């Protein structure tokens, strides 16, 4: 299943305050209007690719979605990031886990015998090497996950919503929740749910963005410069307003089709 991403997944690229300024930057962003893939709790958390990075979201109120899993092979033969968001806190672990058939978490029975998750149920882990650890529908919970030079980052934005069906049109921006110099190689991922919900995914790309920082230091508008010839013009003029005119953005250059290699035949 798919739907339109609109503006979603804009985040503060660096920890600098700026205001009333149209700062231009090259980084991994979710491209404007790109399709997200969409998923459901009705019998759906296979190993996705991660590509350059993931935008994620869920529309929630049940809070059955409670984490994420990442790596190359996710099977203890490498270190695997686990993120949890249980009760009140983001909680993070990076052990050599050995996950069950599904990221189904395990769940909270009647309290009379004490009630807790069992670490999935089948096996869940088969080695330690836990090189890091940490502790901190009505709502949409946006996130971004990227790794560059071993710095894995989490960003987020929590907001109320009315559109049950899709990612809402409009705008909002994500501050970093966490930055982690943990150095793990990530090319695939999964999401945790409890076992008794819907989530979204799209992939980041290296893009130029023009970012309108407002008077309160806050990013409140963005241009994805590569989206279309108009957005190339907005970034060419460093401006969200373009007047009636004609503007050179670039040079259209026929890409090389193949590599034709010749040497003396000796």
């Amino acid at each position, epitope marked *: 299943a798919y739907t339109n991403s609109f503006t979603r997944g804009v985040y503060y690229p660096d920890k600098v305050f700026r205001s009333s300024v149209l700062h231009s930057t090259q980084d991994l962003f979710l491209p404007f209007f790109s399709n997200v893939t969409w998923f459901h709790a009705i019998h759906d958390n296979p190993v996705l690719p991660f590509n350059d990075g993931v935008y994620f979201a869920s529309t929630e109120k049940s809070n059955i979605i409670r984490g994420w899993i990442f790596g190359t092979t996710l099977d203890s033969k490498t270190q695997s990031l686990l993120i949890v968001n249980n009760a009140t806190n983001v909680v993070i672990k990076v052990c050599e886990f050995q996950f069950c058939n599904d990221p189904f978490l395990g*769940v909270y029975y*009647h309290k*009379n*015998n004490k009630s807790w998750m069992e670490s999935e149920f089948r096996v869940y882990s088969s080695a330690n090497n836990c090189t890091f650890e940490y502790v901190s529908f009505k709502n949409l919970r946006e996130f971004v996950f990227k790794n560059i030079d071993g710095y894995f980052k989490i960003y987020s934005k929590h907001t109320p919503i009315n559109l049950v069906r899709d990612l809402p049109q409009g705008f909002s921006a994500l501050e970093p929740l966490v930055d982690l110099p943990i150095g793990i190689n990530i090319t695939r991922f999964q999401t945790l749910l409890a076992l008794h919900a819907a989530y979204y995914v799209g992939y980041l790309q290296p893009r130029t963005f023009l970012l309108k920082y407002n008077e309160n230091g806050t990013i409140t508008d963005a241009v994805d410069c590569a989206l279309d010839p108009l957005s190339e013009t907005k970034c060419t003029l460093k401006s969200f307003t373009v007047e009636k005119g004609i503007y050179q953005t670039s040079n259209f250059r026929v890409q090389p089709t193949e590599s034709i290699v010749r040497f003396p035949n000796i």
Partner: antibody
Amino acid sequence: QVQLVQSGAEVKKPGASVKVSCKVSGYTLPELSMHWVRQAPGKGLEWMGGFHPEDGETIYAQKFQGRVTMTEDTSTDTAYMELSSLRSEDTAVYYCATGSPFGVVTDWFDPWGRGTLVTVSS
Amino acid sequence: QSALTQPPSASGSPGQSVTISCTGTSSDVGGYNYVSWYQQHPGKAPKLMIYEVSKRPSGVPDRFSGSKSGNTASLTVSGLQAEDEADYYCSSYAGSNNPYVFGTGTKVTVLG
């Protein structure tokens, strides 16, 4: 779904003591309202104890209380009925049961574990 | 507490429908009857049968149902043959959380 499994069949003397385990399988023990019940052989049943979901109390039937006891182990997922100081009417089947079951997801119905027939004689 | 008792057999010829009854001191304490039924076939273990005098467990072939109220409870047996030939014990399950007790049994059989 959960399965309940009795300790086969058993024989102990009058004035001696018997412990019957019940294994539970598919899923773990503490989540389950474990209960225990007598049967006079091929005749009427009678209660002797069980975990209420109120307070987790392993309460007992007054006709057998203190002399009958219950205990548990998570390491094997075994419940236990232990009946001390055996008497003429203790040539019973002892049934394991629980109003719970679960499958990670929560549930509440009362399956039974077939129960150990026991002989008591001199 | 919710003590209870029942008739010996309630038997009938093959293909009959018959009514099990249970009678006692009170309802299951705290509301309508939590009384539940357990069906033991000749020489074999009990199955769970109708519970709270209304709720039907898995695998029941529709030929069984609950009845009556207060200090009494009842269960229907229909089309009776082998394996329907069984002892239908009543027992009380008040809130799942107030002390349980068990009936004298009612052993139906294909009437010889």
